[PDB]
Each structure stands twice: as C-alpha cells, then as structure tokens.
Design a protein around this ligand. Structure first.
Ligand code: HEM
Ligand code: HEM
Lengths: 145, 145
C-alpha cells in the first residue's frame, strides 16, 4: 500500500531529502525547468504527452512550460512538508496520482523522472546517496499508480 | 486582461498579502480545509463540482478532501512567491486557470471564494483591509477564466 511505502521512509532518508531540497527547492523556476527539459532530452518518447504545453524546445521562453515547471516544484514542496505525517503524505500523493492516472501514466513511466532528478541533484553536487533517497519518495507515488 | 489585473498588485497590496500569508499559510491543512468547508457551507450550489471528493460534509475525516485542501494552499503559496515577477505570476495563474476552465468554472463562480477567505482571515484577526488585498489576487485568476 502507499501507506506502507510512506511509513518506510526512515529518519536518515527524510534528512537527506530535506537537506537536498533546501538547495534544489530554492530555485523552483530554474531547477523546475531543468527537470522537465532533461526529461524530454533523455526520454523523447514522453514529449507527446505534454502537447498542451506547445513547443517544449522553447524552454524558459515557453510561458506554458514555465508555469508547469514551477508548479511541479510545489508538488514536491508539498511532499517534503508532509514527511513526518504519513497520513497527510498519503492523501496528497493520491491526489497527484489521480492527475497522472487520468493521463494514462503508469508506475513504470512515472519512474522515468528518476534519471532527471539524479542529474539535477548532481548539478548541485548531491551524490548517489541523495538520488537513492529521492527514488524512495518517487516510489511512494508509484505505489499509488 | 490578466496583465492589467496583475498590475493592480501594488507595493501596499503585496505587503498585505505577504504579512497575512505568514499566518494563514503556517497551517495549510487546518486553514485549507477551513476554506473549502466554508465554501460548501455558504455556497451549497458549488458542491456538485466536487463530485470526485465524495462526501465533503465529513470535512477533515475525508482523505480526498484533506488532500485537495492542502494542495490548494500550495497554489496560493505559489502565487505569493511569484509576486516579485509579474511574468512568472501570470504563467502560473494561467496554468491553474486551465484547471478550472476544464471544470466549467466561470470567473463569477471562482469569485465565490472571496467570502470564505474573508471569514478565514477574520478568524485570525485580519480585517477587511486584508480581505480586499486577497480579492485583488483572486481577480488576477478571474481575468484568466
Ligand atoms: C517528480 C515527479 C513528478 C511530479 C511531482 C509531477 C507533478 C505534476 C503536476 C503538479 C501536474 C499538474 C496536474 C494538473 O494540473 O492536471 C502534472 C501534470 C502532468 N504530468 Fe507530472 N509529475 C511528475 C512526473 C511526471 C512524469 C515522469 C510524467 C510522464 C512520463 C508526467 C506526466 C504528466 C502529464 C502528461 C501531465 C499533464 C500536463 C498538462 O497537459 O498540463 N509527470 N505533473
Ligand atoms: C483561492 C482559489 C482557488 C484556488 C487557489 C484553487 C486551486 C485548485 C487546485 C490546485 C486544484 C487542483 C487542480 C487539479 O489537480 O486538477 C483545484 C481543483 C478544483 N477546483 Fe479550485 N481553487 C480555487 C477556487 C475554486 C472555486 C471557487 C471553485 C468552484 C466554484 C473551484 C473548483 C474546482 C474544481 C471543481 C476542482 C476539481 C476538484 C477535483 O475533482 O479534484 N476552485 N483548485
């Protein structure tokens, strides 16, 4: 269950999540767009899903892409703030899961975000230990898909 | 015009939004649910739009309602954080506007949130002055519907 996945997040994992989010979450516009473009660069097959955003190759200049990229960072901000209360983390994770379920996004496809996250973390010098911590949070969402 | 509306957010208005947000934004679950339930109570005719959430009369006990309520507070958090840059504020406002446009929510019905916000603010000792400041931020979203 999603609760099980959430309830597993240990004190050390939560610590790494909060320490790395203090940095990458400080520039939501910058790192948010970096996340989305990297996803398109390494997984060109997902571009078709984001047709509402228009030409995603425009990057920062694309207002729709910029608005979306900033908003997803607040979805992560939401997750980070709910880490100590699994009950609240589960209800928010399931809300966002519906957003993707409706778009036919499987657990496997959603996990494609791990690659980009790893690179963004690395751009700020946060190593594998942190990428693994984030993979665990992403897994909570996958438990709902 | 969302841009003219955004231009209405003067120095004083922005200060009032920040000052009041420091208080209501500190308890997103509590105030978020307070907002949504007050909306349903004062405007029963809007309940039909939230069919997905189930029995909204359960308030906090409803996980779907609690997940939704916490999430909208992060939308407001988003707006506040974009106040410095009107170009970024407009792109995030348009993103959320689409979320309501697909739900068939008009500018007039979106405005019905002003009542709840005034009440939630009042319960924290923030008067008309602050209620009006928030009415201007809401107007920006209205200009995009
Ligand atoms: C860190 C992981 C991710 C987060 C936090 C996240 C967050 C979000 C949020 C907040 C929305 C807006 C929901 C709405 O307004 O309807 C969204 C939309 C979307 N997401 Fe994700 N997402 C993530 C990963 C992914 C991945 C990996 C895919 C696909 C491979 C994906 C595909 C979509 C699609 C298709 C939309 C619709 C965009 C639109 O047309 O507006 N997401 N996501
Ligand atoms: C302060 C103003 C408000 C904010 C910031 C806000 C924010 C949000 C957010 C973030 C979502 C989730 C988007 C998604 O995942 O699709 C949402 C959904 C929704 N909103 Fe609003 N909203 C506000 C006012 C209203 C009002 C006044 C109405 C109705 C008269 C309304 C009707 C809806 C509906 C029908 C949904 C879909 C709920 C669902 O099925 O999950 N919203 N809103």
């Amino acid at each position: 269950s999603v609760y099980d996945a959430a309830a597993q997040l240990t004190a050390d994992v939560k610590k790494d999540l909060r320490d790395s989010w203090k940095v990458i979450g400080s520039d939501k516009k910058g790192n948010g767009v970096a996340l989305v473009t990297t996803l398109f660069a390494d997984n060109q097959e997902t571009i078709g899903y984001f047709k509402r955003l228009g030409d995603v190759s425009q990057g920062m200049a694309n207002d729709k892409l910029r608005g979306h990229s900033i908003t997803i960072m607040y979805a992560l901000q939401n997750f980070i703030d709910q880490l100590d209360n699994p009950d609240d983390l589960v209800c928010v994770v399931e809300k966002f899961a519906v957003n993707h379920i409706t778009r036919k996004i499987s657990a496997a496809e959603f996990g494609k975000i791990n690659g980009p996250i790893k690179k963004v973390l690395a751009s700020k010098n946060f190593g594998d230990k942190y990428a693994n911590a984030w993979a665990k949070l992403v897994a909570v969402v996958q438990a709902a898909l």
